[PDB]
């Protein structure tokens, strides 16, 4: 497997002031265009694993990917050395002189007021927010990123100083789309976070909050077809016309249950079965649900208009059947 270099701070680095500086350097390396996407992704994994106390375990546990083998290189501070603030990339037995130059030689006030862990969390939460729309809805990433960020900024989770450039968010999305490796670790982390314990850091609570938005992304029309077509349990379900599409919806629901905890992230992971959930496959039921939905929900003709597949008869029946229901 193509190896990715992950850089982890050693026990020698203790200063909170210093630790933020390394995190900012890790971001810059991820945004360096001279590096290839995979190397840049490894710098992003380095930043994300910074939250976790034992990066090696975090990666071992959640980073078991078929694509990339992660190599962890410890960054330590050597007080003898004068270059690059005494920082060095050292393996247990060796000092990597050239890699030290690569990381360091190659071309603060907030930290005292709010603290290192608060300040890193700003950087790490922004990286996760990119994933909500990066794979599923590339076009709306910047709008979506800021939408989710709004809440965090007001909470003060993300300070105004630490907010990420639009150019930065676009790069992070491209790296995520390019490297499935990144996405698998993030998804697996979320699944390993399913087990509920009081042992969740401020950041891990924040990760799970973003995770709810990331969990069922791209399958929305499937869920809207279920909510406003099947859960309504109106009498039109008996119709012979809807019977084939109802059977398919059954199959897709059963398939989704099959995929397991992985299932919410089908479209995010770009699984082979991810286009089987598209409303074109089951068009009559989708049209009916969209009719019930426009009668039941304020607007939402927004969310579905000028679809090649819309069955006008089913759409109108759905509206009628819902209108009778609204009376009661």
């Amino acid at each position: 497997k193509n190896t990715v270099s992950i850089f982890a701070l050693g026990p020698t680095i203790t200063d909170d002031d210093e630790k933020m500086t390394l995190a900012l350097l890790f971001l810059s390396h991820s945004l360096d265009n001279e590096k290839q996407h995979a190397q840049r992704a490894g710098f992003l994994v380095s930043l994300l694993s910074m939250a976790y106390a034992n990066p090696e375990l975090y990666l071992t546990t959640n980073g078991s990917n078929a694509d990339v083998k992660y190599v962890i290189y410890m960054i330590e501070k050597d007080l003898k050395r004068q270059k690059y603030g005494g920082f060095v990339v050292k393996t247990r037995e060796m000092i990597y002189e050239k890699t030290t130059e690569w990381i360091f030689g190659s071309d603060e006030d907030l930290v005292h007021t709010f603290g290192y862990p608060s300040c890193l969390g700003a950087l790490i939460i922004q990286i996760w927010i990119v994933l909500v729309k990066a794979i599923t809805s590339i076009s709306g990433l910047r709008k979506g990123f800021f939408t989710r960020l709004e809440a965090f900024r007001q909470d003060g989770t993300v300070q105004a100083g630490l907010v990420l450039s639009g150019d930065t968010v676009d790069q992070i999305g491209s790296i995520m789309r390019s490297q499935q490796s990144l996405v698998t670790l993030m998804v697996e982390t979320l699944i390993t976070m399913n087990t509920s314990r009081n042992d969740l850091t401020t950041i891990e609570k924040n990760i799970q909050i973003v995770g709810n938005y990331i969990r069922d992304a791209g399958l929305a029309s499937f869920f809207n077809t279920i909510r406003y077509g099947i859960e309504t349990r109106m009498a039109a379900l008996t119709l012979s016309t809807l019977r084939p599409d109802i059977n398919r919806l059954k199959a897709l629901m059963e398939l989704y249950l099959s995929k397991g905890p992985r299932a919410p992230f089908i479209c995010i992971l770009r699984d082979p079965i991810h286009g089987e959930f598209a409303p074109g496959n089951y068009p009559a039921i989708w049209s009916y649900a969209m009719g019930v939905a426009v009668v039941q929900n304020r607007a939402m003709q927004q969310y579905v208009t000028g679809r090649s597949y819309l069955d006008i008869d089913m759409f109108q029946l759905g509206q009628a059947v819902a209108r009778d229901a609204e009376a009661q």
Partner: peptide, 23 residues
């Protein structure tokens, strides 16, 4: 979790199919 959402629906569909044989 949409598991309850899917579970509720699968049960509803099975009822619909079982009660109404081939429409």
């Amino acid at each position: 979790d949409k598991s309850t959402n899917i579970s509720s629906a699968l049960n509803i569909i099975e009822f619909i199919l079982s009660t109404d044989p081939q429409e």
